Design a protein around this ligand. Structure first.
Ligand SMILES: CC(C)=CCC/C(C)=C(/F)COP(=O)(O)OP(=O)(O)O
Ligand SMILES: [Mn+2]
Ligand SMILES: [Mn+2]
Ligand SMILES: [Mn+2]
Length: 514
């Protein structure tokens, strides 16, 4: 709670300035023509990989699109599959990542039907491990690939850079991380390379520092809004979680053009944090039922008449925030989304009530019934609604209605989110055992120990990602690929924050030197 309002207002990054933005345009051009001189397919694939991990890919989307579509055109040619496990895995990953069909059969040559995968090259095993997270349901080569590579990478840790790479891939594969989060680590990896492109590296450092400066300015503005509502003064438990909330919102949507999206997400998350504390710590069941009903009615007069005192400000802050959100979209693009957004908020609040009734009844649901409700209460459906409504111009009515139909991709993405959050519960918190989350439900239902339940839940997430990979590749859903990314980035942020939940200070506030 050190990064308070006064601290945020005091920042004055040098990289907001117009001179830096000029040198960035200069470097972007010199990089675009250097990309023209990359003609060998593996070099092109390694180029895309580098652009993505450096945080630079959204500046070169046409150039990446061209490389990838040309490689797709060519990769059924006769002697294309050189049978380099590293190169085959890199290509499989990048093509699947960007929605191009590639069969799991590209790996069958590295695999004996009796003894499994045969490889001793760490580079190829690492790349195959990353590629296995792009698997679909029922791809037994890819499942077997993951078994083989994770076993090999674990034994790798029982050369100093090799151990670090194995550790990093085991705790967070590339498919499970949003692009900017890794940028500072990879930027240093990249400059320590003999063959580094020097302009690219300099562009990566500059764009990282400019992004920080952009976010600091947004934080000054969001900070003032939080101060004005004064919830942190009324409710002694309403701690300032603004920077933490902004971190989630930046993981959901990092690009400069999504400033409004990050603002609405940050304030939504700060309010969710307070409301959630009310529902599973401070409110009595009778109070929780009035607040639920006041949300459902969406009637300020009723709410001020009937709510407890310590709930009136929290409700009116939500109410006015959402009504101004609706106003902003109406003004911007003449779309009326109030019923949608307040419906999404109601679903969250209702899911919270269900959990509070479970807790007072000392009822312990089976994992499946817990997750049905828990995927809503983790805020997945609300957050993708918020992201879509604040991050899309023009809003497509058909696209919004698909989100409101509770589609499969939202269902399974939010289940992962919920499982991943519940894994953040600690061991001493399982023993007092008051309110039951994923681990306790699974232990009660299977008799597994806590340690085994954690491992089974971690495997469940990896299997559920396989379903998400299928919905992401479905070119026939109403969700654009842009909208789906908000959702995946939410899940990825939960994976990242389980590891690190000071990296937020490092992401937002300390530039990369020179
Ligand atoms: C921040 C965000 C994007 C969504 C809210 C869910 C989340 C990840 C939390 F950390 C909220 O607290 P908590 O872990 O207490 O949520 P609970 O487990 O009580 O439902
Ligand atoms: Mn809760
Ligand atoms: Mn909680
Ligand atoms: Mn939790």
């Amino acid at each position: 709670s050190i990064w308070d309002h006064d601290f945020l207002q005091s920042l004055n990054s040098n990289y907001t300035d117009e001179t830096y933005k000029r040198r960035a345009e200069e470097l972007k051009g010199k990089v675009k023509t250097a990309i023209k001189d990359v003609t060998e397919p593996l070099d092109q694939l390694e180029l895309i990989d580098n652009l993505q991990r450096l945080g630079l890919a959204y500046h070169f989307e046409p150039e990446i699109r061209n490389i990838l579509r040309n490689i797709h055109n060519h990769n059924k040619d006769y002697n294309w599959r050189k049978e380099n496990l590293y190169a085959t895995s890199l290509e499989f990953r990048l093509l699947r990542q960007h929605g191009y069909p590639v069969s799991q059969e590209v790996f069958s040559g590295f695999k004996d039907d009796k003894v499994g995968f045969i490889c001793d090259d760490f580079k190829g095993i690492l790349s195959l491990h990353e590629a296995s997270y792009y698997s679909l349901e029922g791809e037994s080569i890819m499942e077997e690939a993951w078994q083989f590579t994770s076993k090999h990478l674990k034994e790798m840790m029982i050369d100093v850079f090799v151990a670090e790479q194995a550790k990093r891939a085991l705790e967070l594969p590339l498919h499970w991380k949003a692009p900017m989060l890794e940028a500072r680590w990879f930027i240093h990896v990249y400059e320590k390379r003999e063959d580094k492109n020097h302009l690219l590296l300099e562009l990566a450092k500059l764009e990282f520092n400019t992004l920080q400066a952009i976010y600091q300015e947004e934080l000054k503005d969001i900070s003032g809004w939080w101060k004005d509502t004064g919830l942190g003064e009324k409710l002694s438990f309403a701690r300032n979680r603004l920077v933490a909330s902004f971190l989630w919102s930046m993981g959901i949507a990092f690009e400069p053009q999504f400033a409004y999206c990050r603002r609405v997400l940050t304030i939504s998350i700060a309010l969710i944090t307070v409301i959630d504390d009310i529902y599973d710590v401070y409110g009595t069941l009778d109070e929780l039922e009035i607040f639920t009903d006041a949300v459902a009615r969406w009637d300020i007069n009723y709410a001020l008449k009937h709510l407890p005192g310590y709930m009136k400000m929290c409700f009116l802050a939500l109410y006015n925030f959402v009504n101004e959100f609706a106003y902003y979209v109406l003004k911007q693009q003449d779309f009326d989304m109030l019923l949608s957004i307040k419906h999404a908020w109601l679903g969250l609040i209702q899911a919270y009530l269900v959990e509070a009734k479970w807790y007072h009844s000392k009822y312990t649901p089976k994992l499946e019934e817990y997750l049905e409700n828990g995927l809503v209460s983790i805020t997945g459906p609300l957050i993708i609604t918020i992201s879509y409504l604040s991050g899309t111009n023009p809003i497509i009515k058909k696209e919004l209605e698909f989100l409101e139909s509770n589609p499969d991709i939202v269902h399974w993405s939010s289940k992962i989110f919920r499982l991943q959050d519940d894994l953040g519960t600690s061991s001493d918190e399982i023993q007092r055992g008051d309110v039951p989350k994923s681990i306790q439900c699974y232990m009660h239902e299977t008799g597994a120990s806590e340690e085994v339940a954690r491992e089974h839940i971690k495997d469940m997430m990896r299997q559920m990602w396989k379903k998400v990979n299928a919905y992401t590749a479905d070119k026939d859903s109403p969700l654009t690929r842009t909208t789906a990314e908000f959702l995946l980035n939410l899940v990825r942020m939960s994976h990242f924050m389980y590891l690190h939940g000071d990296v937020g200070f490092t992401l937002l506030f300390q530039p990369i030197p020179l």
